Amino acid sequence: DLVQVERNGPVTTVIINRPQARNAVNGPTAAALYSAFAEFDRDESASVAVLCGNGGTFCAGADLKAFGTAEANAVHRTGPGPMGPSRMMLSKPVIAAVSGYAVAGGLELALWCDLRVAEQDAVFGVFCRRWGVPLIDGGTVRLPRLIGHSRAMDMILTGRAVQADEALAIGLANRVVPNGQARQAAEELAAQLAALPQQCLRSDRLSALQQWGLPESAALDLEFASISRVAAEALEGAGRFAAGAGRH
Amino acid sequence: SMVSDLVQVERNGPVTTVIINRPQARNAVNGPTAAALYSAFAEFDRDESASVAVLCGNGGTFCAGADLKAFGTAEANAVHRTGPGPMGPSRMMLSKPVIAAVSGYAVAGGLELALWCDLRVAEQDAVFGVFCRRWGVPLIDGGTVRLPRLIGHSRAMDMILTGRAVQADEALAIGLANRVVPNGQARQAAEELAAQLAALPQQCLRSDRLSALQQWGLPESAALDLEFASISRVAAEALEGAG
Amino acid sequence: VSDLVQVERNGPVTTVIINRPQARNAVNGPTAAALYSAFAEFDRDESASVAVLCGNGGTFCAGADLKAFGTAEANAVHRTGPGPMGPSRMMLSKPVIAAVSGYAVAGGLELALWCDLRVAEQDAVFGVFCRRWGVPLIDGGTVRLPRLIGHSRAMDMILTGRAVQADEALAIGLANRVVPNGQARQAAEELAAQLAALPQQCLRSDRLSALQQWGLPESAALDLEFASISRVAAEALEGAGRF
Amino acid sequence: DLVQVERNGPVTTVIINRPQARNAVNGPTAAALYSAFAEFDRDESASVAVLCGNGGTFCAGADLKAFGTAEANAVHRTGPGPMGPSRMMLSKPVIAAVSGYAVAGGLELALWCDLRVAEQDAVFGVFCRRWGVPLIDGGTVRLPRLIGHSRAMDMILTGRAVQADEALAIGLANRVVPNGQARQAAEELAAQLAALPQQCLRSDRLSALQQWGLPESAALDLEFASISRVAAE
Amino acid sequence: DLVQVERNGPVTTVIINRPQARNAVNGPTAAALYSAFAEFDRDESASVAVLCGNGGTFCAGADLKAFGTAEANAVHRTGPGPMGPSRMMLSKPVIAAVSGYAVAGGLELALWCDLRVAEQDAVFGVFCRRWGVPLIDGGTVRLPRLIGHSRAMDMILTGRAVQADEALAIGLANRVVPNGQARQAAEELAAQLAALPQQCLRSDRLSALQQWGLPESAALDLEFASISRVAAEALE
Amino acid sequence: DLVQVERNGPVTTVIINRPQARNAVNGPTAAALYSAFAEFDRDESASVAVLCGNGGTFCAGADLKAFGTAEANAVHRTGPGPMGPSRMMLSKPVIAAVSGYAVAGGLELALWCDLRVAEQDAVFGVFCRRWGVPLIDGGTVRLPRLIGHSRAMDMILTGRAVQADEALAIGLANRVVPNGQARQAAEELAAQLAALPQQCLRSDRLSALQQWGLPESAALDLEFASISRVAAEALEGAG
Known part of the structure; x- marks a missing residue:
C-alpha cells in the first residue's frame, strides 16, 4: 500500500504510493521500499527495476511531519538508510522515472538509481537545505561522482531547484521526456536493457x-x-x- | 582595510570578503601576500560570527598566480612540503565555504585559488586557464587534484595539458564557473550569494x-x-x- | 603497407596507426602486441614528446577482433601484463591523443579513453557496442569512462551500449575537439605539436x-x-x- | 623552562622538562615541543633530533590535571596535536630516548619518533585506556604500522604495560640499553645518522x-x- | 543448535557447535553466526564477544561436504560472507579462543577477531590452499595487516601449518595458554576489557x-x- | 649471458650472471631480468620462479661503476624500474634464493620477490645509505609493508647489515638454510608451490x-x- 510493486516480465516497477504526502518517505515507507528492492535483488526472474511515484511526483524526501512520531525515519549507523534502499548496492540496475519533484531524500533516491528519466517539468533539488535536515542517504557521496564536484557543490550549498532542461544539460537527468511519460519511458528502456x-x-x-x-x-x-x-x-x-x- | 594592504579583509555581517590587493601586479601573489591570505582564511575559519567568505581581487582581475618576478628574492612564495601552500590557503580544508568572485583573469595559481573555492561566480569577460604551462611552472596548489574532480578528468586534462584560456561562457558550460554575471558584478553577485547561504x-x-x-x-x-x-x-x- | 601497426614520426610527435581497415581496425593478438610495443618504444624514446593514436581507412578501432576468437591470433587475456587491447593498462610518461574517425567502439572506445585527449571527426561515433554482444569491458572502460565524464553519463553509455555521435560527445566532455570529417589525424597531430612545443x-x-x-x-x-x-x-x- | 634544547653539532636534543609531573605534557609544554621541532626542521645545520625526558622518565602523557584550565592541551581539528609535535612530518629523523615510562600520549610521542632506544627497565603502554581518554596523537595510526595490527590491537585494547624486552621482541623498541644510558645511546646513534x-x-x-x-x-x-x-x- | 550463544554479564560467547564436523561451517551455520554477531552488535548490554568451537577444535573452515547441496555456503557479493560474520566491522571487539585447528575459513574467522588466544597445541593454517578453495572471508586482506606481508605471504602461498609457538612469535596468536584453557582465558580477557x-x-x-x-x-x-x-x- | 634462465618443469630459475661484479645490475642486465620475468609471466608451462645470483652472492644493487657509460642503469619514471623487474606485478610468485649479499637495489629485488630463502651467512641491507644513492626500486614501499615500519625505518636509516638469523627473527627471511643451499631449497619450495x-x-x-x-x-x-x-x-x- 505505501509502496506498490508491479511486475511485467523481467521488469519490476517499484512505486512510492503516498501521493497525498507528495510521496514523502516515512519509516514504514522506507521499510517497504527496502523490502521491495531486497526482493527484486534476489528474484532471478527480475532483471531491471524502475522506481517511480504515484500522483504526478517522484519523492519529496523524508517525511518531516513524522519527525518525533513513531512513524519517523529510522536513523542507524547500520542496516537500511533512512530513505530505505539508499545504502544498497544492488546486483541489478534501477531506472528512476522522475515526475514532479525529486527533492531532498527523494533526490537521493534518484541519485541512487542507475539512470534518471525526467519529465519536462520535473524538478531536482537539495530542498532539505532550507530545513536544516542533512543529506544522510548518499547525496553527498553520489552527487559529486554523478555530475562532478563543482555542480554538486552548487546544488548542495544553495539547495536550488534544478529544472529538467538544466538537469539534462549537466548530466543529472539522462533523458527528458514529456509530462506524464517518465514511467512509460523508464519501463520501455528497462525492457530494452533486460533483453x-x-x-x-x-x-x-x-x-x-x-x-x-x-x-x-x-x-x-x-x-x-x-x-x-x-x-x-x-x-x-x-x-x-x-x-x-x-x-x- | 588599507590601499597598502597586500590582502584587504572586509566583514559584513556573517559574510567575510577577502581581497587580493595588488592591482599593479595583476594580483599575483608573492610570499608576503600568501602569508596574509593564509592568515585571513585562518581567522575566518576560527571566527564563529563569520559564515561564508568571498575571495576576489581589486582592479578588475582575480589572480595571476605566483609572483614570478619575486622568485630569487626574499618575497618569493614559500615552497615547502608542509605548512601553507605556495599560494597561501591552497592546502586548507576550511569548516565553512568560500565563494570565488572572478573578474579578469584567474590563471595558474590564481586558477588554483578559484578551484580551492567551493563556488565560482565569473564575470562575462573573465578568463580561466593553466597559463603556467607556457611559463613551465608546475601546478602545486591543488590544480591537478581539484580540476579533474570539479569538472571531470577529460576536460581537466584538456585545460592542464594545453594551458589554454577558457572564457566565461565555456567555463559555465563545462561546470568550471557556477554563475556568469555582467562585467563589474562578480564581487556583488558573490557577496549576495554568500549572504543567501549565511541565512x-x-x-x-x-x-x-x-x-x-x-x-x-x-x-x-x-x-x-x-x-x-x-x-x-x-x-x-x-x-x-x-x- | 602490410604492418598491422604503422609508426610514423614527425619531430617530437609519434603517430601510432592501426592498419587493419579491412577489419575496421579491430585488434587481434598480434595487433595488440604491436600496439603495446609501439607505445613502450614511444615511452622510452627521449626525442618523442607526444603520441597520436589513429586508424587507417576512415575508422579508429572496432574493438577486439571477434573473428580471431578461437584462433591462434585471438587477443591474449591475462590478469597481468598488457591488457587484451595492448596498451590499455599502460601509464605512459607522456600524453597520447586519440584521433577518432568513424567508430571507436568496445575495446576501441576503451583505447580512446586510455588516450589523454580525444579529437573526433564530425561523423565519429563512440560506444559500448560490446553490450549487444555480451563481451565485457576489460580494457579500462568501466574505470575510465565514469572518471572522464562523470558516473551518470558513463552509466548511460555502459548500460545502453548506445552510440554517442561527436556533437553529443563534445557536449558531455567525451570528445575534447570536433573537427571536419577526414581531419582528426591532422588536427590531433597539430594539437600534439603544440603540446610538444x-x-x-x-x-x-x-x-x-x-x-x-x-x-x-x-x-x-x-x-x-x-x-x-x-x-x-x-x-x-x-x-x-x-x- | 618546560622544554630544553641542547645542540651538539648536527644532533639536536629536545628534553621534556617537567619532572615534577613525570614529564606529563600540558598545553604550554606541547607548545614548546612543537616550537623546538619546527625550529629543528628549519635549521639547515641540524640533521638528527633526539627526544627524551629529564629525571629518569620519558613522558606520562597529557597532564590530566590541566584539563579544562588555561594550561590544557589544545584539542583542535587543525594545527598542532594535543601533545605538540604529534601531527608533524618533519623532513629529518627523530630518535626517542626512552627512560622510565612512555605511556598514553607519551607512548604516542615515542611512536612519532623514527626509532626508539629503550632502557632495560623502561615501560611502554596505552595507559589512557584505564583513565578513559582516547588516543588522539596518532597512536591508533602509528602503532599498527610499526608493529603490525595484531600486536597493536593487543596493546590498544588492554592498555597493558610492555617492558623493554618484549618491546624489542615485537619491534616497538629498536634498541635496548642499560638503565640511564638511553639518551647517550640515542645521541650516538643520531651522530652516526648525521655522518x-x-x-x-x-x-x-x-x-x-x-x-x-x-x-x-x-x-x-x-x-x-x-x-x-x-x-x- | 549449530551455533550456541551464552551471555555472562557484558560478555557474549558465541560457540560453533558442530564438533563431529570439526566445526566446519555450512550455509546454516554461517547464517546463525551472522545473526549472533548482528545481535551482539546491537545489544547495548553486551560489551565484548568471544568466538570458540565445541569439542576441542575452533573451526575447519567451509564445510566441503555441503558444496552443491541445499546447505551450501552462500556466496554473494553482498550480505553475509560465506563464513557468516566475516565482512562485518562490529562496533565492539571479539576475541578468538583457538583450540585444535583454526584453518582455511576458520583461520579467517580467527583473523576477523580482534585478538587470538591459542591453546599450546592449537594449529593455524591456510589449509584451503590444498583444496583450491579461495580465501573469500577476508584472509588475504587481514593476514598481511596483522603480521606483515612477508609472513602472511608465506602462510598464504604454502598453506602450511602454523603451531601456537610460532604463532605467538610472529604476532598471529596474542596469548598462548595450556590445552583446554583458551575459552576460559579469552572470556577472562573479555571481562577485563568490558570493565x-x-x-x-x-x-x-x-x-x-x-x-x-x-x-x-x-x-x-x-x-x-x-x-x-x-x-x-x-x-x- | 648476463642473466641465465633455466626451466625445470613448472619452475623457472632466473640467474643474475655477473659474479665478477658481485651480481651488480647494469642497464643490459636489468633489461634481461625484465625480459626473463615478462616471458615467465606469460609462459603457460611456468608456475613459480626463483631469483638468484651466481658465484655465491645474490645481488649488490645497481651497477654504480657503470654510470655515464652505455651500460648505465636506465632511470625513468615509467616502464621498467632501474633494476629491471622491480615495478612488475606478476601473476605468479617469485622466490628469492639469497646467498651472500642482497643489498641496496639487490635488497629491493629480494623484497619484490614473494618469499626469501636465505643462506646462514647471507646479509641483507640498505648499503646505498653509505654510498648516498637512493632507494628507487621499491625498498621504501616494500620493506615497511613486509616487516613493519619500525624495523624498516631502522634498516633504511642506519643502512646497517642484517644477518640471516636476525632477518628470520624479523620476518625479512622466510627460511634460513645452510650455505650453498638457497637455490636448491628455493627450487624445492617452488616445486611444492607448483604442485x-x-x-x-x-x-x-x-x-x-x-x-x-x-x-x-x-x-x-x-x-x-x-x-x-x-x-x-x-x-x-x-x-
Whole structure:
C-alpha cells in the first residue's frame, strides 16, 4: 500500500504510493521500499527495476511531519538508510522515472538509481537545505561522482531547484521526456536493457560503481574479473542444460 | 582595510570578503601576500560570527598566480612540503565555504585559488586557464587534484595539458564557473550569494559540504559512513526545521 | 603497407596507426602486441614528446577482433601484463591523443579513453557496442569512462551500449575537439605539436599528478602533486643541459 | 623552562622538562615541543633530533590535571596535536630516548619518533585506556604500522604495560640499553645518522613514511621522486 | 543448535557447535553466526564477544561436504560472507579462543577477531590452499595487516601449518595458554576489557582498523573524530 | 649471458650472471631480468620462479661503476624500474634464493620477490645509505609493508647489515638454510608451490598484494572476485 510493486516480465516497477504526502518517505515507507528492492535483488526472474511515484511526483524526501512520531525515519549507523534502499548496492540496475519533484531524500533516491528519466517539468533539488535536515542517504557521496564536484557543490550549498532542461544539460537527468511519460519511458528502456546479455551488463555496471573507491590498478584488476564472471555464468548455464540431455 | 594592504579583509555581517590587493601586479601573489591570505582564511575559519567568505581581487582581475618576478628574492612564495601552500590557503580544508568572485583573469595559481573555492561566480569577460604551462611552472596548489574532480578528468586534462584560456561562457558550460554575471558584478553577485547561504541553517550546510569534500576516493560504504556522522552534528537544527 | 601497426614520426610527435581497415581496425593478438610495443618504444624514446593514436581507412578501432576468437591470433587475456587491447593498462610518461574517425567502439572506445585527449571527426561515433554482444569491458572502460565524464553519463553509455555521435560527445566532455570529417589525424597531430612545443618536464609532471590523484584523499594527493617542484627543476635543467 | 634544547653539532636534543609531573605534557609544554621541532626542521645545520625526558622518565602523557584550565592541551581539528609535535612530518629523523615510562600520549610521542632506544627497565603502554581518554596523537595510526595490527590491537585494547624486552621482541623498541644510558645511546646513534649522506637518507625516509595507505603504483612513483630530489639539492 | 550463544554479564560467547564436523561451517551455520554477531552488535548490554568451537577444535573452515547441496555456503557479493560474520566491522571487539585447528575459513574467522588466544597445541593454517578453495572471508586482506606481508605471504602461498609457538612469535596468536584453557582465558580477557571505559576503547579500536585504508594525514583526521565536539571543548 | 634462465618443469630459475661484479645490475642486465620475468609471466608451462645470483652472492644493487657509460642503469619514471623487474606485478610468485649479499637495489629485488630463502651467512641491507644513492626500486614501499615500519625505518636509516638469523627473527627471511643451499631449497619450495591448485594460489596472492592501502570494504570486494576466477578456471578446464 505505501509502496506498490508491479511486475511485467523481467521488469519490476517499484512505486512510492503516498501521493497525498507528495510521496514523502516515512519509516514504514522506507521499510517497504527496502523490502521491495531486497526482493527484486534476489528474484532471478527480475532483471531491471524502475522506481517511480504515484500522483504526478517522484519523492519529496523524508517525511518531516513524522519527525518525533513513531512513524519517523529510522536513523542507524547500520542496516537500511533512512530513505530505505539508499545504502544498497544492488546486483541489478534501477531506472528512476522522475515526475514532479525529486527533492531532498527523494533526490537521493534518484541519485541512487542507475539512470534518471525526467519529465519536462520535473524538478531536482537539495530542498532539505532550507530545513536544516542533512543529506544522510548518499547525496553527498553520489552527487559529486554523478555530475562532478563543482555542480554538486552548487546544488548542495544553495539547495536550488534544478529544472529538467538544466538537469539534462549537466548530466543529472539522462533523458527528458514529456509530462506524464517518465514511467512509460523508464519501463520501455528497462525492457530494452533486460533483453541484453545480462551477466555482461551486470558485471560492467558493478565494476563502474566499485571503481570509485579504488586506485586505477586495483580498479582495473576488479574490472578484469568480469571475463571470469561472464564465462563462469555461461558455462554454469550450459552445464545445467547438458545435465538434462538424454534424461528428460 | 588599507590601499597598502597586500590582502584587504572586509566583514559584513556573517559574510567575510577577502581581497587580493595588488592591482599593479595583476594580483599575483608573492610570499608576503600568501602569508596574509593564509592568515585571513585562518581567522575566518576560527571566527564563529563569520559564515561564508568571498575571495576576489581589486582592479578588475582575480589572480595571476605566483609572483614570478619575486622568485630569487626574499618575497618569493614559500615552497615547502608542509605548512601553507605556495599560494597561501591552497592546502586548507576550511569548516565553512568560500565563494570565488572572478573578474579578469584567474590563471595558474590564481586558477588554483578559484578551484580551492567551493563556488565560482565569473564575470562575462573573465578568463580561466593553466597559463603556467607556457611559463613551465608546475601546478602545486591543488590544480591537478581539484580540476579533474570539479569538472571531470577529460576536460581537466584538456585545460592542464594545453594551458589554454577558457572564457566565461565555456567555463559555465563545462561546470568550471557556477554563475556568469555582467562585467563589474562578480564581487556583488558573490557577496549576495554568500549572504543567501549565511541565512540558511548552518550546521547542516557545513556537514553536507564537508561530507561531499571528504567522500572523494572512499569506497561507497566508507563514504556513506562518513556521511552518516552528519546526523549527530545537526540534530538540533533538523528537529527545529521540521517544526 | 602490410604492418598491422604503422609508426610514423614527425619531430617530437609519434603517430601510432592501426592498419587493419579491412577489419575496421579491430585488434587481434598480434595487433595488440604491436600496439603495446609501439607505445613502450614511444615511452622510452627521449626525442618523442607526444603520441597520436589513429586508424587507417576512415575508422579508429572496432574493438577486439571477434573473428580471431578461437584462433591462434585471438587477443591474449591475462590478469597481468598488457591488457587484451595492448596498451590499455599502460601509464605512459607522456600524453597520447586519440584521433577518432568513424567508430571507436568496445575495446576501441576503451583505447580512446586510455588516450589523454580525444579529437573526433564530425561523423565519429563512440560506444559500448560490446553490450549487444555480451563481451565485457576489460580494457579500462568501466574505470575510465565514469572518471572522464562523470558516473551518470558513463552509466548511460555502459548500460545502453548506445552510440554517442561527436556533437553529443563534445557536449558531455567525451570528445575534447570536433573537427571536419577526414581531419582528426591532422588536427590531433597539430594539437600534439603544440603540446610538444611547451615546456615538457612541467607538462609531464602536471599530467601524471592529475592521473594519480584519482582515489586518493585530498591531502595525500597534494603530497604527490608537490613532488613536481623537485621533479621539474631537476629534469628540465638536466634536459636543457643535454640539449 | 618546560622544554630544553641542547645542540651538539648536527644532533639536536629536545628534553621534556617537567619532572615534577613525570614529564606529563600540558598545553604550554606541547607548545614548546612543537616550537623546538619546527625550529629543528628549519635549521639547515641540524640533521638528527633526539627526544627524551629529564629525571629518569620519558613522558606520562597529557597532564590530566590541566584539563579544562588555561594550561590544557589544545584539542583542535587543525594545527598542532594535543601533545605538540604529534601531527608533524618533519623532513629529518627523530630518535626517542626512552627512560622510565612512555605511556598514553607519551607512548604516542615515542611512536612519532623514527626509532626508539629503550632502557632495560623502561615501560611502554596505552595507559589512557584505564583513565578513559582516547588516543588522539596518532597512536591508533602509528602503532599498527610499526608493529603490525595484531600486536597493536593487543596493546590498544588492554592498555597493558610492555617492558623493554618484549618491546624489542615485537619491534616497538629498536634498541635496548642499560638503565640511564638511553639518551647517550640515542645521541650516538643520531651522530652516526648525521655522518651519512643526508639527502638520500631524508628522501628514503619520507618515502617510507608517505607510502602507507597509498596504492603501490603511486607509492613507487612518489619514491621515484627521490632521484629528482637529490638532483635538485 | 549449530551455533550456541551464552551471555555472562557484558560478555557474549558465541560457540560453533558442530564438533563431529570439526566445526566446519555450512550455509546454516554461517547464517546463525551472522545473526549472533548482528545481535551482539546491537545489544547495548553486551560489551565484548568471544568466538570458540565445541569439542576441542575452533573451526575447519567451509564445510566441503555441503558444496552443491541445499546447505551450501552462500556466496554473494553482498550480505553475509560465506563464513557468516566475516565482512562485518562490529562496533565492539571479539576475541578468538583457538583450540585444535583454526584453518582455511576458520583461520579467517580467527583473523576477523580482534585478538587470538591459542591453546599450546592449537594449529593455524591456510589449509584451503590444498583444496583450491579461495580465501573469500577476508584472509588475504587481514593476514598481511596483522603480521606483515612477508609472513602472511608465506602462510598464504604454502598453506602450511602454523603451531601456537610460532604463532605467538610472529604476532598471529596474542596469548598462548595450556590445552583446554583458551575459552576460559579469552572470556577472562573479555571481562577485563568490558570493565574498562567502553567509549574510548571502541573508538581507539575503530580508528586502528580504519587507518589501514588511509595515508597518515587522513588517518590522523579520522583518529581525531574519536573525540566528540562537546568532549573537545570539555578537555580544553 | 648476463642473466641465465633455466626451466625445470613448472619452475623457472632466473640467474643474475655477473659474479665478477658481485651480481651488480647494469642497464643490459636489468633489461634481461625484465625480459626473463615478462616471458615467465606469460609462459603457460611456468608456475613459480626463483631469483638468484651466481658465484655465491645474490645481488649488490645497481651497477654504480657503470654510470655515464652505455651500460648505465636506465632511470625513468615509467616502464621498467632501474633494476629491471622491480615495478612488475606478476601473476605468479617469485622466490628469492639469497646467498651472500642482497643489498641496496639487490635488497629491493629480494623484497619484490614473494618469499626469501636465505643462506646462514647471507646479509641483507640498505648499503646505498653509505654510498648516498637512493632507494628507487621499491625498498621504501616494500620493506615497511613486509616487516613493519619500525624495523624498516631502522634498516633504511642506519643502512646497517642484517644477518640471516636476525632477518628470520624479523620476518625479512622466510627460511634460513645452510650455505650453498638457497637455490636448491628455493627450487624445492617452488616445486611444492607448483604442485598445488594454481588459479586459487595465484588469486589469493594477487588479492594479498593489492589489498595494501585499501579500506577494508574495497579490499574485500577485490578479494571476493577470486571465487569467479577459480570457478571460470574450473568450468573452462572442463570445457
